[PDB]
């Protein structure tokens, strides 16, 4: 009977594949065939019977076999615009670890803030969420991660518990970067789609702008961040030695030497890449996106990462009778996480197979017959629906689905069409459970410290915190701003 | 005095001095990302996977394609087949299955010096039918320098004969299958697009006209390579015996590997052209959904599931992503974004009418110039680089001179794989050059004699037995006027 115990994750794979086969065979519709794929692929990284990148190739195997989408179309989703930003930023992250730009930022910050385990997991949440309201969510988690990984590395190495304090700064960065993106419109991509859709569906309204979006979400994002900091720190880890452990940090700073030539070039290109992401289209000032304002939406944040990320292959670093560049590409293929680029692309082919089948439209059509309900319960069914569907799909894919559904739903029962749209837009970007749903969650699995069950157990509590603040906010301190109780005049009559 | 040291820093800035793109509107901008990428591919001023990301950078900057559209062309159906084939290539040499069927085609033939280098030339030509010719050249070459060491221990001339017969026979065997190399998979990807109504190019009909084409070449290359170099027996047949008795009986991890290698080879033929209908009639309502590359992912993903030891699978992901070439996935995918960048810009319509004065010579003369040009050009550049730049040039030329598009592209996707000279041409003969033998002059004399017999079979092929298979004089319903 002991042979079952050692092969417990091989018999499990052939079980759930065969026992769920009555679902797409008895039922013949393509919604029941995409639901079989969404039940098999999703439970293969929850229980983790297989590695995470093998199950991401399973969308590209049974979606052509069921007749949902061809093999040419399911293969064009494993490399999207996320991977051009992902490639061009780990050409920067490679050339700061080789020339050791970190350990000169981590051995300078630790001897300025002190070796405190409790007040350094708040400086990584309050500075990330301030940096995230100007940049994107992906480009913020890609910069502050190789520096804050070196900070927790040096404090552990200055001991002359370590496995559980590395899961904090991985999770406090993936969560604070998406929490700080709720504050402004141009802070994330989900808030920009809602701003474009509301200004054309309801013209002559004129309320949503910079500053008006801030003062109803900045009190909402500050309570979530201060409650996530208590919840994340308690779940993982709830001066005769301090004087000795503060001298190892100073002594390791002396053997570095002066700052060389090859660290200033990476420090300069760390700034120009950050001063071009911020100055692209900041909304309240025109930027260099108004120079290309004849082919709009062509040059994105991924061409900025490739413009400076490919300059590390050119700049000379050390003479040899050739020269040597900064990154040389031989130690780039060993530094690039090639398992994340398949795992993220596997979640993109599943969000494109649900749209082609109709399973995303099937769930959204069940929300429209809820007209015989109170005005607060129709939010509560809708707000937990978008948080569930955003764990398998991307955030710009869920908001374009539900905005043409909730807009005729917010006109038949004479309710204001911002009392439903606002608590469904903020809860769209509450992707905390799976790393296939959020690109800030995928620059956190590229370090090998967290498991999948450590994100589900620690991200399920942040969703209850995140929903209960917006549900509190939709009744207090937002209803005097946009007047969410009376039916407005920029809406249809009947 | 120091301008020779920083050699390709001052050479890399040719994005400045030939800049005649601010004068013209749109087609001079697309033919600026075609000439910068080409001179960086021919001269190799960059790591050769960096230049594939330059069409991802300066195509949206000019205003030709959006960044969401140029990014989707970096992952075709070729890459799902590339992942599934190098799941077999890991499990073949991790469990030493490649050392067993190489000491079996040796000692079944004799130890004669002219029969030894025919068993080596036919072993790697059969392994290259299914694997990529780069991957199977990295397996037989560690064995081919262990058999020849024990032969002479029972000199320098017979060493380099074995050095270049391994590299040349895998390149000959890299064709006869669409999934045998990356050059054949680029063309069939480019031919299923841009001519979608044509259904005449599959795995079955590719085997019929090109397997005679590589049986004349492989038999008259072994004769030619023997002529250039040359022309106690119980100890040679005993020193080979002890290594085959050093590896014990066939294990469980080697029986399973060659079962999943035969079944994957028994498929890709059971899509079954016009003789029989195969399992492409099982999925009848969806005609082109389950393609040639969803079988490589079906078999190749079973290696991570089948138990091997104590559990641990047949292969792990750690030894997969340290084994798969990610340089090829960016270089091939970076050429598809450039080939689809000269279709949304009208560059391959301006070349598709300026070569109308070329459409006055007879049809056999258009082939011989355009096949000797790409054969002379594939000796200095890599094989997915020369087939990338010429496919949006030859196929607009074919549609304007009233010739079949299969009449030019079939003898030009085979002649571009004839990289037999100096070793920067292809990693088939760059693996064997890393050893201390086969000086660069000895690859010219051994490469020129096999490149003449290479293009003489293709020029004899497309006039005798290929015309009754594709009807190359009868300009078709597709490729419209
Ligand atoms: Na943000």
């Amino acid at each position: 009977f002991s042979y079952i115990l050692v092969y417990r994750r091989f018999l499990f794979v052939v079980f759930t594949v065969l026992v769920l086969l009555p679902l797409p065979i008895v039922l013949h519709t393509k919604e029941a065939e995409c639901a079989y794929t969404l039940f098999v692929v999703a439970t293969f990284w929850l229980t983790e019977a297989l590695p995470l990148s093998v199950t991401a190739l399973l969308p590209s195997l049974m979606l052509p076999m069921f007749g949902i989408m061809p093999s040419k179309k399911v293969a064009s989703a494993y490399f999207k615009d996320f991977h051009l930003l992902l490639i061009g930023v780990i050409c920067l992250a490679t050339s700061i670890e080789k020339w050791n730009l970190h350990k000169r930022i981590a051995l300078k910050m630790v001897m300025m803030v002190g070796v405190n385990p409790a007040w350094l997991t708040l400086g990584f949440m309050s500075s990330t969420a301030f940096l995230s309201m100007w940049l994107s969510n992906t480009s913020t988690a890609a910069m502050v991660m190789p520096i804050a990984e070196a900070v927790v590395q040096q404090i552990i190495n200055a001991e002359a518990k370590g496995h559980v304090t590395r899961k904090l700064t991985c999770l406090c960065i993936a969560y604070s970067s998406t929490i700080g993106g709720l504050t402004t419109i141009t802070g994330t991509s989900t808030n920009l789609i809602f701003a474009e859709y509301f200004n054309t569906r309801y013209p002559d309204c004129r309320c949503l702008n910079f500053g008006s979006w801030f003062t109803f979400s900045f009190p909402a994002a500050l309570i979530i961040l201060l409650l996530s900091w208590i919840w994340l720190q308690w779940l993982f880890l709830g001066t005769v030695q301090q004087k000795a452990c503060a001298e190892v940090i100073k002594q390791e700073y002396q053997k570095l030497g002066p700052i060389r030539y090859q660290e200033i070039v990476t420090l300069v290109l760390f700034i120009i890449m950050a001063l071009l992401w911020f100055s692209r289209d900041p909304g309240f000032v025109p930027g260099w996106s108004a120079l290309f304002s004849e082919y709009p939406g062509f040059a994105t944040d991924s061409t900025v990462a490739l413009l400076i990320g490919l300059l590390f292959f050119l700049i000379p670093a050390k003479t040899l009778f050739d020269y040597s560049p900064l990154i040389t590409w031989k130690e780039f293929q060993s530094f690039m996480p090639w398992d994340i680029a398949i795992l993220v692309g596997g979640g993109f082919a599943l969000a494109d197979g649900c749209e082609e089948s109709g399973l995303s439209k099937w769930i959204g059509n069940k929300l429209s017959p809820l007209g015989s309900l109170p005005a607060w319960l129709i939010i509560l069914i809708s707000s937990l629906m978008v948080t569930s569907l955003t764990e398998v799909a991307s955030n710009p894919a869920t908001i374009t689905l539900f905005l043409p559904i909730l807009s005729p739903l917010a006109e038949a029962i004479h309710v204001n069409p911002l009392y439903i749209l606002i608590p469904s837009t903020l809860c769209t970007s509450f992707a905390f459970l799976l790393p296939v749903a959020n690109p800030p969650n995928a620059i956190v699995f590229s370090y090998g410290h967290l498991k999948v069950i450590d994100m589900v157990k620690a991200g399920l509590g942040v969703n209850i915190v995140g929903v209960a603040v917006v549900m509190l906010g939709i009744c207090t301190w937002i209803v005097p701003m946009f007047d969410l109780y009376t039916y407005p005049s920029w809406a249809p009559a009947m």
Side-chain angles (χ1 to χ4, degrees), chain A residues 181-182 188-195 198 208 213 216 382-383 386 395 399 402-403 406 418 420-430 470:
Chain A
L182 317 177
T188 188
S189 64
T190 317
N191 295 1
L192 260 178
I193 298 179
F194 174 71
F198 189 81
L208 292 176
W213 193 270
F216 89 105
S382 316
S383 159
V386 189
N395 296 323
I399 189 62
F402 281 102
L403 275 171
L406 296 157
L418 273 172
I420 317 292
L421 290 187
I422 281 175
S424 311
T425 313
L426 303 184
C427 309
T428 303
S429 42
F430 284 165
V470 188

Side-chain angles (χ1 to χ4, degrees), chain A residues 132-137 140 177-178 180-182 187-188:
Chain A
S132 165
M133 61 178 55
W134 320 113
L135 317 176
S136 165
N137 288 333
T140 318
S177 89
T178 82
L182 317 177
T188 188

Side-chain angles (χ1 to χ4, degrees), chain A residues 5-37:
Chain A
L5 201 63
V6 56
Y7 304 134
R8 54 177 196 181
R9 69 173 174 87
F10 170 68
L11 305 167
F12 177 74
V13 173
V14 310
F15 183 72
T16 174
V17 164
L18 266 54
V19 78
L20 283 181
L21 266 181
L23 176 64
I25 285 303
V26 174
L27 277 79
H28 205 73
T29 42
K30 292 194 182 318
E31 293 101 359
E33 294 169 350
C34 196
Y36 168 74
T37 313

Side-chain angles (χ1 to χ4, degrees), chain A residues 117 120-122 124-125 128 144-145 148-153 164-176 232 236 444 449-450:
Chain A
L120 260 187
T121 187
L122 194 45
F124 288 154
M125 299 189 77
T128 308
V144 308
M145 200 70 222
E149 188 53 51
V151 175
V152 63
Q153 182 65 51
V164 83
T165 186
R166 283 179 171 169
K167 312 201 178 71
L168 276 182
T169 54
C170 273
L171 276 187
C172 306
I173 282 177
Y175 290 170
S176 45
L232 282 177
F236 287 98
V444 168
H449 298 325
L450 276 163

Side-chain angles (χ1 to χ4, degrees), chain A residues 32-209:
Chain A
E33 294 169 350
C34 196
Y36 168 74
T37 313
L38 211 45
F39 282 172
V40 161
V41 177
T43 61
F44 277 169
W45 46 57
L46 280 180
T47 59
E48 216 180 6
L50 286 184
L52 299 201
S53 311
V54 173
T55 79
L57 304 155
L58 294 185
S60 73
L61 168 70
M62 54 186 63
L63 282 189
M65 285 197 68
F66 274 126
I68 289 176
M69 62 192 297
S71 197
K72 279 186 173 301
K73 207 153 299 308
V74 79
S76 87
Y78 278 66
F79 207 100
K80 283 191 172 177
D81 212 9
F82 165 74
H83 307 264
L84 308 177
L85 176 62
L86 188 68
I87 277 173
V89 77
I90 320 171
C91 311
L92 173 78
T94 310
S95 162
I96 70 170
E97 299 215 4
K98 166 181 168 57
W99 297 113
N100 267 340
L101 189 70
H102 73 90
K103 305 183 57 180
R104 219 192 286 269
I105 321 170
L107 288 186
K108 188 52 189 180
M109 272 165 29
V110 159
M111 61 186 203
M112 276 206 299
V113 78
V115 278
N116 217 345
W119 273 35
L120 260 187
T121 187
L122 194 45
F124 288 154
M125 299 189 77
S126 43
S127 88
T128 308
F130 171 69
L131 189 64
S132 165
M133 61 178 55
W134 320 113
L135 317 176
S136 165
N137 288 333
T138 301
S139 45
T140 318
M143 298 195 326
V144 308
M145 200 70 222
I147 285 93
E149 188 53 51
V151 175
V152 63
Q153 182 65 51
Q154 291 312 307
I155 301 177
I156 288 174
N157 284 6
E159 298 197 20
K161 194 256 298 175
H163 187 32
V164 83
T165 186
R166 283 179 171 169
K167 312 201 178 71
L168 276 182
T169 54
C170 273
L171 276 187
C172 306
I173 282 177
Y175 290 170
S176 45
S177 89
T178 82
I179 276 162
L182 317 177
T183 45
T184 78
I185 286 175
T186 323
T188 188
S189 64
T190 317
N191 295 1
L192 260 178
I193 298 179
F194 174 71
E196 290 167 32
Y197 179 75
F198 189 81
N199 285 321
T200 76
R201 177 75 146 85
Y202 304 96
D204 198 8
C205 170
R206 310 286 295 274
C207 54
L208 292 176
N209 48 76

Side-chain angles (χ1 to χ4, degrees), chain A residues 142-462:
Chain A
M143 298 195 326
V144 308
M145 200 70 222
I147 285 93
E149 188 53 51
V151 175
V152 63
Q153 182 65 51
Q154 291 312 307
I155 301 177
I156 288 174
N157 284 6
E159 298 197 20
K161 194 256 298 175
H163 187 32
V164 83
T165 186
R166 283 179 171 169
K167 312 201 178 71
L168 276 182
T169 54
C170 273
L171 276 187
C172 306
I173 282 177
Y175 290 170
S176 45
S177 89
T178 82
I179 276 162
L182 317 177
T183 45
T184 78
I185 286 175
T186 323
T188 188
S189 64
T190 317
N191 295 1
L192 260 178
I193 298 179
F194 174 71
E196 290 167 32
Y197 179 75
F198 189 81
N199 285 321
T200 76
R201 177 75 146 85
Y202 304 96
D204 198 8
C205 170
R206 310 286 295 274
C207 54
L208 292 176
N209 48 76
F210 198 90
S212 164
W213 193 270
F214 199 81
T215 176
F216 89 105
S217 69
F218 183 74
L222 198 56
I223 304 178
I224 296 176
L225 195 74
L226 269 298
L227 280 162
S228 298
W229 175 78
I230 302 174
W231 159 251
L232 282 177
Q233 199 202 16
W234 173 83
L235 191 54
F236 287 98
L237 48 96
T239 80
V240 285
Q241 304 259 298
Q242 196 262 350
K243 274 192 55 47
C245 280
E247 292 293 326
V248 194
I249 295 297
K250 177 60 70 178
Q251 218 280 332
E252 287 181 353
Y253 196 65
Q254 300 312 114
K255 52 178 57 56
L256 282 176
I259 180 166
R260 34 187 171 182
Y261 165 68
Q262 298 102 5
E263 301 179 0
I264 304 180
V265 189
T266 69
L267 192 65
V268 159
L269 296 186
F270 190 84
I271 290 174
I272 309 181
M273 198 185 298
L275 285 185
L276 282 182
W277 281 336
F278 165 67
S279 179
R280 176 174 76 87
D281 214 29
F284 72 110
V285 191
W288 56 263
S289 159
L291 303 185
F292 298 118
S293 75
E294 293 85 4
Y295 305 103
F298 270 36
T300 44
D301 267 351
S302 315
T303 73
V304 183
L306 286 176
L307 180 54
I308 312 191
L310 290 189
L311 281 188
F312 283 90
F313 299 98
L314 292 176
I315 296 176
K318 204 164 297 181
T319 41
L320 258 59
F321 206 63
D322 219 337
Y323 72 101
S324 189
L326 290 165
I327 187 179
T328 204
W329 183 79
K330 196 46 78 192
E331 41 202 356
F332 170 69
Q333 198 190 349
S334 81
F335 204 87
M336 177 71 195
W338 296 109
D339 45 343
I340 301 304
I342 302 186
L343 172 72
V344 174
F348 281 149
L350 258 186
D352 295 18
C354 290
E355 290 253 349
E356 283 270 279
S357 317
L359 199 66
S360 295
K361 202 181 60 176
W362 169 264
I363 305 170
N365 287 6
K366 294 214 305 177
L367 205 67
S368 290
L370 294 184
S372 65
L373 273 189
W376 54 269
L377 189 49
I378 183 58
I379 296 175
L380 189 75
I381 301 304
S382 316
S383 159
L384 315 172
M385 170 159 315
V386 189
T387 54
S388 298
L389 295 202
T390 193
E391 302 306 328
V392 301
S394 44
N395 296 323
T398 321
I399 189 62
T400 75
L401 167 68
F402 281 102
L403 275 171
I405 304 179
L406 296 157
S407 315
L409 191 59
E411 286 156 342
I413 321 102
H414 213 56
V415 68
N416 199 293
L418 273 172
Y419 184 68
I420 317 292
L421 290 187
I422 281 175
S424 311
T425 313
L426 303 184
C427 309
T428 303
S429 42
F430 284 165
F432 301 133
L433 307 185
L434 293 176
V436 308
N438 209 3
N441 293 9
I443 313 170
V444 168
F445 268 15
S446 87
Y447 287 81
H449 298 325
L450 276 163
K451 309 162 189 170
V452 192
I453 201 65
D454 292 3
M455 290 193 73
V456 180
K457 191 204 301 298
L460 201 43
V462 192

